[PDB]
Amino acid sequence: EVEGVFVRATVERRCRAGFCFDKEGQGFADGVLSDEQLEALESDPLLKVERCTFSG
Amino acid sequence: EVEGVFVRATVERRCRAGFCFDKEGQGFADGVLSDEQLEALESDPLLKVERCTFSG
Amino acid sequence: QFPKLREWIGQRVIKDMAAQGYQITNKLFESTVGVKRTDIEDDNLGVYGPL
Amino acid sequence: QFPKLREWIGQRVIKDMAAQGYQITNKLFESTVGVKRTDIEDDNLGVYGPLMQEMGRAAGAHPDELVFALLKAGNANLCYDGQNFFDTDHPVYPNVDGTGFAPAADPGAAWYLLDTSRSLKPLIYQERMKPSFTSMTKEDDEQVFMADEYRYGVRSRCNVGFGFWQLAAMSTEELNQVNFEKVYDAMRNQKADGGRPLDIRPNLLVVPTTLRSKAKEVVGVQRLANGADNPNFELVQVLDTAWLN
Amino acid sequence: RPLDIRPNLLVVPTTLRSKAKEVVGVQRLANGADNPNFELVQVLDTAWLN
């Protein structure tokens, strides 16, 4: 099981091309790959964040 | 009337077809009918709740 | 009773306490037998009267 | 442990000693109930108020549940050896040993107790009373009462625990003599590094309520189930429980 | 969670009084084998039923 999910329509910093804008991607508290890119992508939320059990 | 919907921002337990998912915001708080099943319906308001009457 | 400790899984599974009312009423349980004044006061053995 | 003291002829072998470091993480447990603030005062029989304090009773009962859940998982879970706690292929230095309804034979007088618990933090009481949370001003008049727990069991010694019984008492030669006394012999025959004994003294028998009477018959009555005999009378004292199975 | 029940009363009709006493009250049940339930539940007999 993976612990870590953000499902409150919450905002996170995801960078597409030359800018970082609101979007929900990985949104997990565990990492095995893309750690350096995840840091920029996984900036903790701006707004209310609540976690669930995807169990994927 | 519906004294409380107990829906906004919260998701409760909904046991259907043998799998108890969490969605559809079926929260309620009254003694009208299916009072015993009210426990099962409200068995997992995992997320923060925010009541708002529908005046039903 | 207070719910069993399940797990962390990040969030809290909020629970609701259970009311288990059980209504029950009362009844009446009389019984008796009819007799006669003359019979009680005229019998000699006297076993008619320990009612 | 040290190697056995060997004979001396011409020179001394400078032996070495092994190490079996065991790793196990911590888990977090919680149970909370959401209640209406107005309702707790709106009562005259003194009920619906003690329920919030009932989380203390729940937390007090929690460690037993955790330890016995780990006991149930014993067959599934792995010990320091890397095999299952109750496994028939426990790796000993020269060869492989084997210790595999819901039985378990344990020592109690040893310096270690099997299935050791971990009361890492106390049964702290978590509460949601009034102007301490947002559930009560920018929300309904809701209050939650919770008991946080940060404990976990341990698979301590898989070379002293035995399970997987057809626990029975009959004929004093085939059912008990070959299963319970078999476990007795296996536990007392355990050998450590160098071939020395572990000084295993089985004195704890843990079984669910279903096996309580039959365990009492195994330990407590001179005759087993047919009037033949009972070699295992007053050898292992059984404590009943229901948390497992 | 277990209820932690401690059954200590055995109430049976008169026709079962002897069998209940055998279950609790003697070391052997009916064939000299054993009685695991000896001195376990104190049996009280009753004749208000059946």
Residue numbers in the entry:
A (entry chain K), B (entry chain L): 53 to 108
C (entry chain F): 52 to 102
D (entry chain A): 52 to 151, 160 to 304
E (entry chain F): 255 to 304
Please share text taken word for word from the publication where this structure appeared.
Bacteriophage Casadabanvirus JBD30, from the order Caudoviricetes, is a temperate phage that infects the bacterium Pseudomonas aeruginosa. The virion of bacteriophage JBD30 is composed of an icosahedral capsid, long flexible non-contractile tail, and a baseplate. Using its baseplate, JBD30 attaches to Pseudomonas aeruginosa via the bacterial type IV pilus, whose subsequent retraction brings the phage to the bacterial cell surface.
Similarly to auxiliary proteins of phage λ (gpD), phage YSD1 (gp16), and phage P23-45 (gp88), the minor capsid proteins of bacteriophage JBD30 form homotrimers docked on the threefold and pseudo-threefold axes. Whereas the auxiliary proteins of phages λ, YSD1, and P23-45 form an outer chainmail net with the trimers connected to each other by their N-terminal hook extensions, the minor capsid protein trimers of JBD30 are not connected. The fold of minor capsid protein of JBD30 consists of a three-stranded antiparallel β-sheet, short β-hairpin stabilized by a disulphide bond between Cys67 and Cys72, and an α-helix. Cryo-EM density of the N-terminal region of the minor capsid protein, residues 1–52, was not resolved enough to enable determination of its structure. The interactions of the minor capsid proteins with major capsid proteins are mainly electrostatic. Negatively charged minor capsid protein residues Asp96, Ser95, and Glu91 form a pocket for Lys66 from the extended loop of the major capsid protein. The major capsid protein residues Glu198, Ser194 and Thr193 interact with the minor capsid protein residue Lys100.
